[PDB]
Design a protein around this nucleic acid. Structure first.
Ligand code: ZN
Ligand code: ZN
Lengths: 61, 54, 110, 35, 76, 82, 227, 91, 392, 97, 55, 40
RNA sequence: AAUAUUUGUUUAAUGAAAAGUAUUUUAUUAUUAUAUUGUAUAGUAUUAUUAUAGUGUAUAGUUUUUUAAAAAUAUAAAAAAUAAAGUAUGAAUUAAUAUCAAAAUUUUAAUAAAAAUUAAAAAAUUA
RNA sequence: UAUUUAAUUUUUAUAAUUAAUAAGAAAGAAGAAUAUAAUUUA
């Protein structure tokens, strides 16, 4: 019985840690879609002090 | 360097005070009842003890 | 940064409250007497290897502090600033000379 | 030795003389004679 | 004795405050930068008691400011 | 839209009391020896203060014998031959 | 090693000061968490030889984020304990610092020292914060109330708004302290500290919670007052 | 480091710094072949991230595994079909 | 082996096989048992070794035994409490008798003489004070007994208070009785507000500003007439101006200005109130506001020498973020010397206040910074709070 | 050329003209990054101005140079500009034959 | 230590410049023009004014 | 809130909040004296 | 002895019957069982280097280790890593001594810090 | 730890009339620390 208890206990914690993880990644990708959304109106390139022509060059990227 | 500190000798040598025989202070029946601290010149207003609960 | 100095601070402050409670004047107070004499003591085990031990003694002292009023006193000025403070403040827009404003003495006609 | 002449240094004033310029100068005099 | 308190030493020469005169502080400031903060023109190594200006100190290649009498609140 | 361990259990059919007991030490749920800190142990009432029971100040870390019986110790009627 | 992140810690002038740690590994780990934390909230109060080191590193992160490059990003991402902070860096700092090249962080030596040990405390901020998007009108003179609450705002500046994706993260991380198992963690921590004993740590019967619902409903109240 | 999904065994690779050390053995990531968040394991070690001064950058040498994986992909055989498009040093 | 006494407090080195002893952690020494074991005594409940038997008898006799009083007795006690009217008569009388015989200071030449202490005065004044409901500075009183003029005023105003209370009743006690179950300030109350104003006025000469400002509060507590109200409000403005309370100065300052319609033409009060309201604006650094105010004062009061002085001063003196940053006056230096943050203590790196208990700065509820316990809190087995890889 | 303080002296032009033939293959169309004191940041800001070429940098009006070095912020720009101004013509001459 | 030291031995240390320096010495200070607190020049307040203009 | 107030104080002719309220309550009290002298 | 020591900025000690001490205020079935009885931290004088062992199992990161130069010691590659002004805590060996005993020469019953002669040793701190 | 040597007592404008084989306002980082005595900086 304590064998089966020991395994049953380690199984479902593995289960809910995955629930944690999936929901986490979900929320973080939501976050990133929010950031991607907000960076557009503000006009944030997040490619630095340079204008678009700089990575257009593609020598520097 | 500006201050002046010279070491006190009472810290080097501190013999305990003479104990009483049969709890008799030899001069009780001679001297006055004035608190010794007073005549010594020892006095205070607040005595703040840090061994108190407060 | 010394511990003693902090202890003496607590003492100073309390005796200052007391000396103002007695009717004296804060600004003309000065330390008349500061001394310290040995107080009670506690003890502690220090266990040393191979079945040895010694007694660590935790010491404690009594402190005696007397504040006295001294009318003749004149205090050195601490309101002087380093040149740096002066012109940094100038560049900030602050006045380097603090504002005095004349205040009419309190009087009762009613 | 704690004396003044020995302790004080001229580092702060080096911009008054153009070390780089003179090094290149004697490199010119290095190739001119062919070393 | 009169109380042992030192008078103001802030404006005398100090060897550890003298180090900061020519030191570069651009990172210690944000809005308020001044040309050289610790350096007082004409006065020796920052200290106001030690003023040299409009005496004859011969300094061919460096600038020197003229003399205006200092106020009482800048010394002590 | 968070994790919320209770509604995480309700989805997995795990009996929410149990799921929580997965994530705190075995000491605080099931009858098993383990480190206890003397400040948890609780204190009788002083003149200034009230009494302090470790029941009140640590509801969650108190042992649950429902789980203890259903998990660790054996049933008698499972073994009976009579 | 002239590259503007990877650091050399000596006492010679070519190198930035080596603050006391266990092993150059441990040192690097410390540096990383100071940088992480300073990017998260703009100021870092820091003791010892760490402070100049922290300033220089900060300047290096801003320099990287200015470079605005994929290799730059990925190099910063190697270095930080927080991935999201890389994003906050490359989003924010380029607008912020576009007009200045040099010395982006301001170190300030504090007149108070740790009582723990004589070591001196420094206050390290990023410089001009009025161009900062999410740090705009903040006032660090004193701390906030409960440390999971959004920091103070200058009176004239009350009604400012911040990037949605940052306050999302912040509220997420905040919401685990309104839970009960945190309160249990709090009491039990008191107990633990007392056992190791650190003086002036109240008995866990006296420890009443950091967060209640009343304090909360007024906190949210003034939080939307600031919005 | 080399990482392969548990279920579909899809392979990919990236550097792991001193900060990500707890994630070296198991990663969670989005798998392109089976589309969802999955679990990746560490088969083989490749290279460092940082380096010490006056020392070569490329000698915590990647294993024979990772190099075999970079021969199989990105080799003469692997590149030969794609070159009719690009010959990657070219645009 | 065994280089010191066999007592288990003794100085030098011992051995366990020779001089065996059990393990005592902190055991009170040969004299005094001191601060440390006592700390244990007041928190843990006994000395930390657990050997010592807790003996609380003497403090039990001092606290619980003393307050024991049986219901039948304490039910009847409040029937025998002293009569307040008689109390005021007595306290006033002997307070006065004690002040009249306080010697006049001998004025020396070349050095200031120490004013003879008030030891004996503190006893009557303490009872007089709490009979009345107002607290008085000892300092201000001493300063009052220095100046001949002030000692005169104080003396006779006291005398009148005495007389009006003996022939009549105590008006604040009347107005207290009619309150829980509207008229102009009575004669005795006038006497009172006058003597309190005098003692506060002396309290300024000595340079305790906080105390003068505190005393005039209780002073206005007694004035129900408009003019006394104006004057006293103004005085509180000037006392809180020196004490560097600008909010209180800018409050009490404008009350005196509000009261101008119902106050007689013979009052300097409202003008003063204006002055204070203005100055309190000026020390908080807004000079437009200041000039506006003084402009209104010279609008209403035409020529006024005080408002003239402030007109000329503001005229002579001629950023929102930097306002009231400056320390301009000395009393906040004095208050800055206490209640300040020092190197090594009383800063945020030493002990911190939380809900009236002391914490180490390690665990500080307002700060999550480096070394704080809250950095190590973990995720508490629920959800992932942050995207941080390594720490948290 | 590189570490020169302030003005660019003629003895210093000489250094440049000398090191012109130290490198055998160069066309007036050569990419910017071969220049003295041309950094990554300096190059980038030049590129978004559509300038890839030593000729193009020797074509600058010098009030482009300053606001390139002040409002924009490439330091030591005047050094690369001056270096170009120097070198451009001998490149054309070695270009013809 | 081969021998017990007498009171003079103990006092000899306090003649030293080291001992004086460490223990008995007075600090120079002035009043912060912002804080009205006592202050040593070169150390500052965590405050928005003290950090900008450091006085 | 900065420009909010910069709008507020310039609607009031360069007054502040306290000067506005002070003026107001002053008027209400002078009109209380008016009610007084009209009633008495 | 203003000495040594201590110094709490980041955890896979998962598990734990054999410990024979530690006010659980009511720790607690909902049982399927019947009565009765009993569940959390003290081995080695310590909250020690850190226990012994029988269970059973593998992604709960299961969350107390000061510091702003250099010799020499210890590890590892004379380089590298660590440790020494420091705030606070505070032992142990030792102790016939005068504010100390430095240099040389001879003698004296055996080193002679004993004599006698000539002489020229400042204080503090560190190695 | 006593003696004994070696070093130090934290810029001394400067050193040698002889012995033996040398000392001006003061302590944080000596660096505002990534070798510029500010690389332009809000
Ligand atoms: Zn897959
Ligand atoms: Zn300040």
């Amino acid at each position: 019985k304590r064998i089966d208890t020991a395994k049953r206990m380690r199984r479902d914690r593995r289960r809910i840690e995955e629930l944690k993880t999936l929901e986490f990644w979900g929320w973080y990708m939501k976050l990133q879609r929010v950031r991607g959304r907000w960076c557009r109106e503000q006009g944030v390139s997040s490619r630095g002090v340079y204008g678009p022509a700089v990575d257009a060059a593609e020598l520097w990227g | 360097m500006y201050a002046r500190f010279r070491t006190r000798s009472k810290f080097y040598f501190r013999p305990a005070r003479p104990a009483l025989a049969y709890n008799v202070d030899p001069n009780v029946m001679r001297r006055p009842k004035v608190k010794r601290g007073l005549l010594k010149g020892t006095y205070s207003d607040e005595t703040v003890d840090l061994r108190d609960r407060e | 940064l010394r511990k003693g100095h902090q202890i003496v601070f607590r003492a100073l402050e309390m005796a200052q409250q007391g000396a103002e409670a007695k009717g004296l004047d804060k600004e003309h107070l000065r330390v008349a007497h500061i001394s310290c004499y040995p107080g009670p003591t506690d003890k502690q085990i220090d266990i040393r290897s191979k079945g040895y031990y010694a007694w660590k003694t935790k010491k404690s002292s009594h402190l005696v502090l007397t504040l006295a009023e001294d009318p003749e006193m004149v205090l050195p000025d601490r309101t002087c600033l380093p040149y740096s403070s002066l012109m940094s403040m100038k560049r900030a827009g602050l006045s380097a000379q603090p504002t005095v404003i004349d205040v009419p003495a309190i009087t009762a006609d009613g | 030795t704690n004396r003044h002449f020995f302790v004080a240094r001229a580092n702060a004033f080096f911009s008054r003389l153009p070390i780089a310029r003179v090094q290149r100068s004697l490199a010119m005099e290095a190739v001119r004679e062919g070393r | 004795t009169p109380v042992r308190d030192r008078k103001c030493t802030l404006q005398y020469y100090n060897p550890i405050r003298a180090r900061f005169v020519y030191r570069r502080d651009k990172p210690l400031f944000d809005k308020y930068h001044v040309t050289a903060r610790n350096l007082a023109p004409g006065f020796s190594r920052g200290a106001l008691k030690h003023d040299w200006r409009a005496l004859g100190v011969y300094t061919p290649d460096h600038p020197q400011v003229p003399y205006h009498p200092l106020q009482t609140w800048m010394l002590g | 839209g968070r994790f919320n361990m209770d509604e995480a259990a309700a989805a997995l059919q795990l009996n929410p009391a149990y799921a929580a007991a997965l994530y705190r030490p075995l000491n605080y749920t099931f009858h098993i020896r383990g480190q206890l800190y003397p400040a948890q142990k609780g204190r009788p009432s002083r003149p200034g203060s009230l009494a302090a029971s470790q029941g009140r100040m640590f509801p969650l870390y108190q042992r649950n014998d429902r789980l203890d019986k259903e998990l660790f110790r054996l049933n008698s009627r499972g073994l009976t031959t009579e | 090693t002239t590259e503007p992140l990877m650091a050399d810690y000596g006492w010679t002038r070519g190198k930035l000061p080596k603050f006391r740690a266990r092993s150059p590994f441990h040192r690097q780990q410390i540096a990383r968490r100071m940088v992480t934390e300073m990017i998260r909230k703009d100021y870092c109060i820091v003791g010892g030889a760490r402070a100049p080191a922290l300033r220089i590193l900060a300047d290096h992160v801003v320099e990287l984020a200015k470079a605005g490059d994929t290799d730059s990003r990925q190099q910063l991402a190697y270095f930080l304990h927080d991935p999201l902070m890389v994003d906050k860096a490359f989003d924010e700092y380029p607008r912020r610092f576009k007009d200045m090249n040099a010395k982006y962080a301001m170190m300030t030596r504090l007149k108070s020292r740790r009582r723990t040990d004589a070591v001196a405390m420094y206050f390290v901020e990023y410089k001009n914060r009025d161009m900062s998007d999410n740090h705009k009108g903040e006032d660090y003179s004193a701390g906030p109330e409960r440390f999971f609450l959004p920091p103070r705002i200058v009176e004239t500046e009350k009604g400012i708004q911040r990037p949605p994706h940052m306050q999302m993260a912040f509220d997420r991380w905040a919401s685990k302290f309104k839970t009960e198992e945190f309160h249990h963690w709090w009491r039990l921590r008191h107990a633990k500290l007392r056992y190791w004993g650190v003086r002036n740590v109240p008995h866990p019967s006296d420890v009443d919670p950091l967060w209640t619902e009343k304090e909360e409903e007024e906190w949210h109240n003034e939080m939307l007052a600031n919005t | 480091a080399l990482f392969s999904c548990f279920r579909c065994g899809y392979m990919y690779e990236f550097a792991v710094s001193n900060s990500y050390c707890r994630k070296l053995t198991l990663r969670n990531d989005h798998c392109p072949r089976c589309d969802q968040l999955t679990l990746f394991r560490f088969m083989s070690v490749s290279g460092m991230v940082g380096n010490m001064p006056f020392k070569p950058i490329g000698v915590p040498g990647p294993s024979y595994a990772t190099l075999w994986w970079r021969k199989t992909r990105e080799g003469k055989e692997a590149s030969a079909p794609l070159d009719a498009v690009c010959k990657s040093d070219r645009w | 082996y065994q280089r010191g006494g066999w007592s288990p407090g003794s100085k030098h080195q011992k051995h366990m096989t020779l001089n065996p002893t059990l393990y005592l952690y902190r055991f009170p020494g040969p004299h005094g048992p001191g601060p440390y074991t006592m700390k244990y005594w007041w928190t843990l409940g006994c000395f930390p070794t657990g050997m010592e038997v807790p003996f609380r008898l003497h403090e039990f006799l001092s606290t619980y035994q003393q307050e024991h009083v049986p219901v039948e007795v304490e039910e009847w006690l409040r029937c025998y409490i002293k009569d307040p009217l008689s109390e005021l008569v007595n306290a006033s009388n002997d307070f006065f008798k004690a002040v009249e015989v306080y010697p006049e200071v001998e004025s020396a030449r070349g050095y200031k003489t120490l004013q003879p202490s008030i030891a004996p005065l503190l006893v009557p004044m303490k009872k007089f004070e709490e009979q009345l409901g107002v607290k008085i500075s000892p300092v201000g009183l001493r300063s009052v007994l220095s100046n001949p003029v002030l000692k005169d005023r104080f003396l006779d105003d006291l005398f009148d208070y005495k007389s009006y209370v003996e022939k009549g009743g105590s008006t604040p006690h009347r107005r207290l009785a009619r309150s829980r179950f509207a008229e102009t300030t009575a004669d005795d109350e006038r006497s009172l507000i006058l003597l309190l104003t005098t003692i506060s006025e002396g309290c300024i000469n000595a340079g305790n500003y906080s105390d003068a400002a505190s005393v005039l509060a209780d002073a206005l507590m007694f004035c129900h007439d408009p003019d006394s109200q104006a004057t006293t409000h103004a005085n509180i403005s000037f006392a809180s101006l020196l004490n560097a309370d600008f909010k209180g100065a800018e409050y009490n300052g404008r009350e005196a200005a509000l009261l101008q319609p119902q106050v007689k033409p013979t009052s300097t009060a409202c003008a003063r109130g204006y002055v204070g309201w203005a100055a309190a604006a000026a020390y908080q650094d807004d000079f437009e506001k200041a000039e506006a105010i003084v402009k209104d004062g010279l609008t209403l009061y035409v020529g006024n020498e005080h408002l003239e002085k402030l007109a000329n001063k503001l005229q002579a003196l001629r950023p929102r973020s930097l306002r009231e940053s400056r320390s301009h006056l000395p009393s906040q230096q004095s208050r800055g010397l206490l209640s300040g943050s020092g190197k090594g203590f009383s800063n945020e790196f030493d002990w911190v206040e939380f809900k009236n208990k002391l914490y180490p700065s390690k665990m500080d509820p307002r700060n999550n910074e480096m070394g704080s316990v809250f950095r190590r809190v973990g995720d508490l087995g629920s959800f992932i709070s942050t995207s941080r890889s390594m720490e948290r | 050329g590189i570490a020169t303080g302030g003005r660019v002296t003629n003895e210093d032009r000489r250094w440049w003209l000398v090191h012109l033939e130290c490198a055998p293959d160069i066309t007036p169309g050569t990419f910017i990054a071969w220049l003295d004191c041309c950094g990554t940041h300096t190059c980038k800001k030049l590129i978004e101005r559509n300038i890839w070429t030593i000729e193009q940098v020797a074509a600058l009006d010098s009030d482009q140079v300053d606001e390139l070095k002040y409002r924009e912020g490439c330091l030591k720009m005047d050094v690369v500009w001056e270096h170009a101004r120097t070198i451009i013509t001998p490149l054309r001459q070695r270009e013809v034959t | 230590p081969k021998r017990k030291k007498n009171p003079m031995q103990l006092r000899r240390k306090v003649y030293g410049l080291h001992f004086k320096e460490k223990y008995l010495k007075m600090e120079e200070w002035y009043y912060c023009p912002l804080c009205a607190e006592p202050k040593k020049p070169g150390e500052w307040c965590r405050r928005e004014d003290c950090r900008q203009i450091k006085p | 809130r900065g420009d909010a107030d910069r709008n507020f104080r310039e609607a009031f002719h360069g007054m502040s909040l306290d000067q506005v309220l002070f003026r107001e309550r002053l008027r209400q009290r002078r009109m209380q004296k008016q009610m007084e002298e009209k009633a008495k």
